Amino acid sequence: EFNILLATDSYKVTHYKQYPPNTSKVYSYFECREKKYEETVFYGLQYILNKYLKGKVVTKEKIQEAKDVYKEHFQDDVFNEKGWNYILEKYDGHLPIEIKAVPEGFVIPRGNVLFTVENTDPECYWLTNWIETILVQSWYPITVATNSREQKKILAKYLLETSGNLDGLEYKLHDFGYRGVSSQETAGIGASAHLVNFKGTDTVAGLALIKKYYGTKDPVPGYSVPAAEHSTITAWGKDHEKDAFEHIVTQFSSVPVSVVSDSYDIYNACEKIWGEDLRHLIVSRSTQAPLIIRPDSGNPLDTVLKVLEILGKKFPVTENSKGYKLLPPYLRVIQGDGVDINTLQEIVEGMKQKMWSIENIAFGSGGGLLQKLTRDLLNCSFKCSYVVTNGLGINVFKDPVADPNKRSKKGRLSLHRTPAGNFVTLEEGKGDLEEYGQDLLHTVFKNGKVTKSYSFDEIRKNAQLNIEL
């Protein structure tokens, strides 16, 4: 079972003897540090608060376990048993902590305070940065949600240009990354973050997380349709790729179905099998049940363009009102190999130059969507900005001589609307001057309790694109 006394960086175990004597208060903040990605979606803290921080997180057994572990780990007795016992005895194991945060789903420019942390008991000054490590893992849902949102922007732009509307946008980037993430837990968290912007997912773990920690009006937040894999085609034998195709589209004849077509020869499969041998089973399909062809190898733009040209000559293509070419409603394409934000952009622009509508295509992304991301992408960072020692409050910060981008903020922080309606972070307690209206941060955690929360439906609303609004 999870033990919060064992969920921090090792060295922080030793930090309580390192602060100045008579320190009563430690106050720290989290930001996506300013240096693409000018704005970030704040999402994920509510999960961490509820799964890891709330309630009785400290027991005698957990204290003893950590004591035993750290003695061997440090080859010495440095663990703060006394501090942790004080929490157990005074607050029934509830963390004397207050956390303030911007609403989840909010889109905020880099360089702004997103949440703040401080101790509510003078004895528990060391506690603020104990929980840095667990809290800083919010970088991941923030970064997935943000990067996913950036991709939706690109998809909106081109769909709008080639089609004149945004129908189907929310199904244009599907989550394929379940097998490509580092763990089950990462799968659920990451899948949940993508669903801030889209509705298509194959990462089932995300559904349960949302249900448990956020909630939706609808039964589920994410959806999928039947589809083949290489094993359901190749199992028929190299000489029976037509038989496999036919069985599969017949099994799923009244619902949408995606069929990977590159097991042996994508171009042959599209031109001869789909476009000639099995054409009669495709053109009979309902507009609500298209066949979605899936190429899965070769240069991503080159293959997409060639697949489209092949189908364009085997099937009746129309020209939409924008002058762009459109496959018939029963036939679509999904590119789910080598898709990340850069290649996605390359494909839609290449499609546009060849006069293909973005209506024709959908994308699947795996590692690119959920795994190929790090904390330094948005520079998610947690730092101390204010301490009270000997009854005096001190504005504190780092400011390394060789890197000004690592300079941290000073003093008590607050977030505000500017007269132009933008965000500004005020430092040095300056928000108390009331020259910038009310602090936009809300108290979301205090003394073991989650004090403010948001539904997944509201998070989605907050994270909408300007074009959508």
**292-311: contacts with ligand 2RM (CB under 6 A):** 292
Listed ranges 20-28, 87-95, 174-182, 455-463: which one lies at the site for ligand 2RM (CB under 6 A): 174-182
Strand, coil or helix: what is 257? strand
**Does position 258 bind ligand 2RM by CB under 6 A?**
yes
Site string for ligand 2RM, 224-243 (x = CB under 6 A): xx-x----------------
Beta-sheet pairing, 318-319 with 325-326: antiparallel
User: Which residues ranging from 13 to 32 are in contact with a copy of itself (CB under 8 A)?
Assistant: 14-15, 17-20, 23, 26, 28
Count of residues that interact with ligand 2RM, criterion CB under 6 A: 21
Which H helix or E strand runs over 41?
strand 39-41
Residue 296: CB minimum distance to ligand 2RM, A: 8
**CA angle 4-6-12, nearest 5°?**
100
Residue 201 near which of a copy of itself, ligand 2RM, none (CB within 5-8 Å, type-dependent): a copy of itself
Supply φ then ψ for residue 181, to 5 degrees.
-95, 170
Whether 95 contacts 53, CB under 8 Å: yes
Considering only CA atoms, which of 62, 38, 179 is closest in space to residue 111?
A: 38
Contact 37, 379 (CB under 8 A): no
The mark string for 199-228 relative to ligand 2RM (x by CB under 6 A, - otherwise) is -x-x--------------------xxx-x-
CA distance readout (Å), 32 to 108, 252, 306: 9, 46, 41
Which H helix or E strand runs over 117?
strand 113-119
Strand partners, 25: 388
The window from 59-67, 79-87, 114-122, 168-176 that contacts ligand 2RM (CB under 6 A) reads 168-176
Among a copy of itself, ligand 2RM, none, partner that 362 touches (CB below 5 to 8 angstroms by kind): ligand 2RM
Question: How many binding residues for a copy of itself (CB under 8 A)?
Answer: 116
The contact mask relative to a copy of itself for 276-315 (x = CB under 8 A, - = no) is --------------------xxxx---x------------
Concatenating the DSSP letter of every residue in 306-335 gives HHHHHHHHHS--EE-TTS-EE--TTEEEEE
Q: How far is the CB of 180 from a copy of itself (least distance, A)?
A: 5
Q: Choosing among a copy of itself, ligand 2RM, none, which partner's interface includes residue 372 (Cβ < 5 to 8 Å by kind)?
A: a copy of itself
List the interface residues with a copy of itself, window 220-239 (CB under 8 A): 220, 222-232, 234-238
- Label residue 237 exposed, middle or buried (CB < 10 Å: 0-12, 13-18, 19+): exposed
338 near ligand 2RM (CB under 6 A) = no
Between CA 336 and CA 339 the distance in angstroms is 6
User: Residues comprising the binding site for diphosphate?
Assistant: 179, 230, 294
